[PDB]
Design a protein around this ligand. Structure first.
Ligand code: SF4
Ligand SMILES: [Zn+2]
Ligand SMILES: [Zn+2]
Ligand SMILES: [Zn+2]
Ligand SMILES: [Zn+2]
Lengths: 754, 351
């Protein structure tokens, strides 16, 4: 297609469209012309990706003002799906128009997923990979290597070829997705990490995780070019406040405090050996403190900066000396002040939560140490570490964490909350004290990014209500519309199984353990699907520990045996790699003959980044509802601040976020308008909150689908899939709900200009 | 109110000499209580129906039959050109009962082994019949699919009330990409119609492969009655056919020669194929008030068609579905029976 929105040609890579898509493009452009936030709903059943990217390229190429676009996905996988998607958009755009592209838009995740060095790649923990690519390609490594040629120092050499060819120019022309980017860089034996990091100043669009825009320790290197007048989208931004309050989170436990004693004693050792051997450069750095924050080499560090910035992007900062801490030995002294004051705060008999300032004044009474010097903990630590040109960091992971800790607590107040639980009750009456601390206001963390940028776009495949977020994140929006799925055919049966066979009102909220009434209820429901359902079926659970009790006692039942006769079980497991291997094997089996089943937490990690086609997804089941106050009171005080700050009480938000995770896991099954399947919920409570379910989803919920029995539901899906396999394709009824190529869009809309 | 094939493409070349192999699944799946007697016995029933249907309409083709049970697949009929072998095989099966589950791979591979001696003019198609929700493979699947469609064998499958996209993908492979062959059902009338269309030779947009001649001759009926003697069953044959060159006696059959191995039919079978060579333009229902033809049927004589305005009823179906190239009438039963049994358009044959 090459059509218009009255102002811009649109090179839609599909001859086909859906009317909802034109609704989407119209309202999103109407926004962009007046740059704003304008919370919206776009169903993932249609791939809004293409709508987004097509309109964005049209707008950026067409209007000459915003040459830069920001598209924040949640995860790297969303990014790469969008990457190949945009690649198709770009190839079609070239095919239709010849070559007008001159276009370079790239994503970036980390060395952990991008370290082309093999030895580093064989490691598993991303922190050690980060430090190791540092050391391997360090602004220091190169020097001591070059004045002193020795086998002590090495490099990926990927940074070398980067320096050589890459850092004068850019990639040839391509939108090199992780596939294409990694292939091409390997063919050029390059370091894709540093490639994108340097490339940042030229890409016409950019993509990355939310975190790179959210964690100021990494959301720091943003340039104005990438910031000033870019255009910013968020997709699947529904589960964002988790990331916000996580980015402003810090829990503790004193085994790390022993590790930090180890590190800080080691720092006593390093200061001793260097100062005896030479303190002269240390005094050079003393005068470098005396001149101030030392941006001369505290920020002018092409590879040096050791400790990243837990604080918001340098906004909550000053530049003076930390007073007496000019002496690095005074520095280590106050390091111990901290660590072991933390230790004395570590073993309270019971739980205690702290405001930063309350405990802060407490500490001053206990130990008269001061906030403004205290903030300089992290930066002073990093600079001293560099001046020690250190060879190891593992002893000092705790030290950088505590730097982060002290910096935030000395920095942030009256929005956050320290809390000190002397154990995990989950293994109560044992020592596992926790000095957890975190924020409570996501709008705070977001506010800098809103402040920089006007033309911000929020869109998730779950968002409801479109007002909760304006409350929580306290922001202005304009066009808050939800797009009801215009379809002339059912194509999805959500149903609320409140009644099992025995019609027992069901839930997991009774408890985290067994009650063979509901147990066999759910076993019967499961196995009856297991027979009737074809390949591809995953049900989601409130909690891994709850699902674990249930699954163990169901292995105790024969309830596993019949599904083992028919289909393939896949279960969830805490290990990321083996979870993923289960995932891919599931996919291969279901696309193959033998049907495969996964089952999982609505909070589960796959439900974050993995979508489901027709094959892998047919029948999803939300057993109970994803609540959490099984777990701790951090959410209790979270709600406390909520109520005293937001006009939202506990149950309201518990329901809100539980149904958020619900619809979040729901959305996967659907790919395109040849997509379909089952959606079942299994608990009583889903009737009251029928209206909190997103627009199209609620449309698929007729009240006649409420509190069905499980046997009638078995019948429902029986006839449902009987229909679904059938090619009821009049294609004369598809024009109105697909708006066939170049005409029904043109016809209706150019007429619909009424 | 019509649901009609708009373009009945048939004037070309369909698959005539089809080496058809129905495959059966006799598993615990075929037991289950969703069909009136069962899936299983009903399937045996409609399979017998298809034996008769096929060997009638494709009276020059061959067949072997295979079932699947207990994670294993089981042939029930050698490649046979006598229907009754298949018929009594099906009988012998119906009384045997299903067990276990289908080892789809083994059935595919057994069929693969079977249709190899089929020459070019003899074409290769298998016929799945599926009602299970899973398979049991011992050999790599898409491996064998590659082998299969690399050896030019499209397959038509008839699954029960589900969908299994491996079936659609494998068919699309076997059917040169284009797919219509994963027909599954929702009703038993639906089931038999599925069969009846499975009977006909199947074109899509043919890959222009080798068009090879086929040579044969024709035998002749015998005269002596007492002279009973046979060379195809070695039994008593009171009178029958006589190979055109090998001049052996053959008990009544359209088979290939059992001495010099050449095909033997009379002509009738060619004529059935021709009935499948140029089928006709569909009888268009004449426009309601603009038709105004003679008020009866031509092919038959059916004076009913309208009541001349009863506001609603007569203004409904001015039913004069009359031919296209001949424009000569034929009533609804006449249209159905012409197009069904004797396509034989007399009005078009008339001139
Ligand atoms: S950026 Fe270069 S040095 Fe660092 S991990 Fe990647 S390949 Fe290795
Ligand atoms: Zn004989
Ligand atoms: Zn002969
Ligand atoms: Zn008639
Ligand atoms: Zn005619």
């Amino acid at each position: 297609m090459k059509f218009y929105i009255d102002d811009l040609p649109v090179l839609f890579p599909y001859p086909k469209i859906y009317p909802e898509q034109y609704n989407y493009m119209c309202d999103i452009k109407k926004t962009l012309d007046v740059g704003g936030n304008s919370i919206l709903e776009m169903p993932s059943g249609t791939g809004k990706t293409v709508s987004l990217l097509s309109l964005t390229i049209a707008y950026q190429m067409h209007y000459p003002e915003h040459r830069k676009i920001i598209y924040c996905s949640r995860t790297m996988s969303e990014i790469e799906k969008a990457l190949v998607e945009l690649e198709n958009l770009m190839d079609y755009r070239t095919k239709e128009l010849g070559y007008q592209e001159d276009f370079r838009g790239l994503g970036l995740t980390s060395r952990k997923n991008l370290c082309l060095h093999p030895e580093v790649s064989k490691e598993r923990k991303g922190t050690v990979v980060d430090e190791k690519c540092r050391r391997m390609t360090n602004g220091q490594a190169k020097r001591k290597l070059e004045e002193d040629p020795e086998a002590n120092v090495e490099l990926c050499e990927y940074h070398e070829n980067l320096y050589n060819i890459e850092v004068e120019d850019y990639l040839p022309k391509g939108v090199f997705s992780f596939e294409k980017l990694l292939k091409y860089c390997e063919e050029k034996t390059l370091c894709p990490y540093f490639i994108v990091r340097r490339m940042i100043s030229l890409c016409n669009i950019i993509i990355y995780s939310y975190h790179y825009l959210l964690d100021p320790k990494i959301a720091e290197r943003v340039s104005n070019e990438v910031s000033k007048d870019s255009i910013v989208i968020f997709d699947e931004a529904h589960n964002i406040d988790n990331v916000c309050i996580e980015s402003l989170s810090l829990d503790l436990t004193t085994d790390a405090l022993r590790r930090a004693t180890r590190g800080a004693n080691a720092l006593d050792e390093r200061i001793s050996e260097v100062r005896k051997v030479d303190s002269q450069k240390l005094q050079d750095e003393y005068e470098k403190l005396v001149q101030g924050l030392h941006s001369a080499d505290i920020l002018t560090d092409q590879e040096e900066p050791f400790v990243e910035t837990p604080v918001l992007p340098q906004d909550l900062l000053t530049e003076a000396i930390p007073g007496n801490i000019r002496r690095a030995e005074h520095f280590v002294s106050f390091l111990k002040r901290l660590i072991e004051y933390l230790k004395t705060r570590m073993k309270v008999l019971h739980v205690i939560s702290e405001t930063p300032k309350s405990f802060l004044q407490h500490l001053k009474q206990l130990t008269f140490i001061e906030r403004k010097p205290l903030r300089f903990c992290s930066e002073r630590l990093s600079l001293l570490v560099r001046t020690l040109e250190v060879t190891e960091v593992e002893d000092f992971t705790a030290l950088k964490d505590i730097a982060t800790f002290a910096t935030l607590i000395s920095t942030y107040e009256e929005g956050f909350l320290l809390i000190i639980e002397p154990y995990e009750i989950e293994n109560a009456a044992v020592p596992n004290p926790i000095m957890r601390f975190t924020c409570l206001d996501a709008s705070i963390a977001i506010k800098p990014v809103f402040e920089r940028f006007s033309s911000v776009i929020i869109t998730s495949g779950t968002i409801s209500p479109l007002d909760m977020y304006p409350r929580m994140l306290n922001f202005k929006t304009v066009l808050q519309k939800s797009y009801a799925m215009t379809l002339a055919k059912k194509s999805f049966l959500p149903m609320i199984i409140t009644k099992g066979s025995d019609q027992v009102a069901i839930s997991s909220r009774f408890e985290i353990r067994n009650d063979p009434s509901i147990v066999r209820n759910y076993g019967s429901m499961l196995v009856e699907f297991a027979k009737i359902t074809p390949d591809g079926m995953v049900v989601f659970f409130p909690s891994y520990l709850y699902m674990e009790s249930i699954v163990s006692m169901w292995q105790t039942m024969g309830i596993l045996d019949e599904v083992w006769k028919h289909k393939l079980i896949l279960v969830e497991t805490p290990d990321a790699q083996e979870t993923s291997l289960a995932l891919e094997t599931y996919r291969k089996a279901c696309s193959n003959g033998r049907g495969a089943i996964l089952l999982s937490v609505a909070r589960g990690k796959v439900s974050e980044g993995i979508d489901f086609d027709h094959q892998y997804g047919r029948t999803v089941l939300m057993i109970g509802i994803p609540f959490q106050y099984t777990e701790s009171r951090i959410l209790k005080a979270r709600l406390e601040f909520m109520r005293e700050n937001y006009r939202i009480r506990e149950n309201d938000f518990l329901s809100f976020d539980a149904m958020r995770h619900a619809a979040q896991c729901l959305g996967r099954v659907l790919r395109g308008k040849d997509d379909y399947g089952v959606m079942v919920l299994a608990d009583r409570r889903f009737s009251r909150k029928r209206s909190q379910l997103p627009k199209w989803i609620a449309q698929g919920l007729s009240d006649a689908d409420l509190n069905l029995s499980t046997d009638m539901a078995i019948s429902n899906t029986k006839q449902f899939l009987r229909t679904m396999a059938q090619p009821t394709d009049p294609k004369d009824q598809e024009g109105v709900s697909v708006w066939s190529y170049e005409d029904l869009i043109k016809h209706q809309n150019s007429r619909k200009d009424q | 109110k019509k649901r009609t094939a708009k373009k009945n493409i048939t004037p070309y070349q369909r698959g005539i000499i089809r080496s058809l192999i129905l495959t059966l699944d006799c598993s615990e799946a075929m037991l289950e209580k969703d069909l009136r007697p069962n899936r299983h016995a009903m399937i045996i029933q409609y399979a017998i129906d298809f034996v008769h249907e096929f060997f009638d309409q494709n009276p020059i083709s061959q067949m072997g039959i295979i079932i699947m049970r207990n994670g294993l697949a089981q042939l029930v009929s050698q490649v046979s050109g006598n229907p009754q072998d298949h018929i009594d095989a099906l009988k012998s099966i119906r009384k045997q009962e299903p067990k276990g589950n289908p080892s789809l791979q083994n059935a595919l591979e057994m069929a693969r082994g079977l249709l190899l001696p089929v020459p070019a003019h003899c074409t290769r198609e298998v016929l799945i019949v599926f009602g299970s929700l899973s398979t049991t493979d011992p050999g790599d699947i898409h491996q064998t699919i590659d082998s299969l469609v690399s050896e030019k064998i499209r397959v038509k499958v008839l699954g029960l009330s589900a969908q299994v996209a491996i079936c659609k993908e494998l068919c699309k492979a076997t059917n040169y990409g284009d797919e219509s062959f994963y027909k599954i059902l929702l009703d038993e009338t639906h089931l038999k119609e599925l069969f009846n269309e499975a009977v006909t030779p199947l074109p899509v947009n043919k890959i222009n492969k080798g068009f090879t001649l086929v040579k044969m001759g024709f035998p002749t009926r015998i005269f002596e009655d007492t002279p009973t003697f046979c060379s195809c069953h070695s039994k008593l044959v009171y009178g029958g056919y006589f190979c055109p060159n090998c001049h052996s006696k053959v008990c009544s059959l359209p088979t290939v020669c059992p001495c010099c191995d050449l095909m033997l039919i009379l002509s009738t079978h060619l004529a059935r194929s021709y009935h499948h060579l140029m089928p006709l333009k569909t009888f268009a229902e004449v426009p309601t008030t603009e038709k105004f033809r003679s008020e009866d049927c031509f092919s038959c004589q059916s004076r009913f068609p309208x009541x001349x305005x009863x506001x609603x009823x007569x203004x409904x179906x001015x039913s004069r579905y009359r031919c296209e190239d001949c424009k000569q009438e034929f009533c609804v039963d006449c249209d159905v029976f012409i197009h069904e049994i004797l396509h034989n358009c007399p009005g078009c044959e008339s001139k």
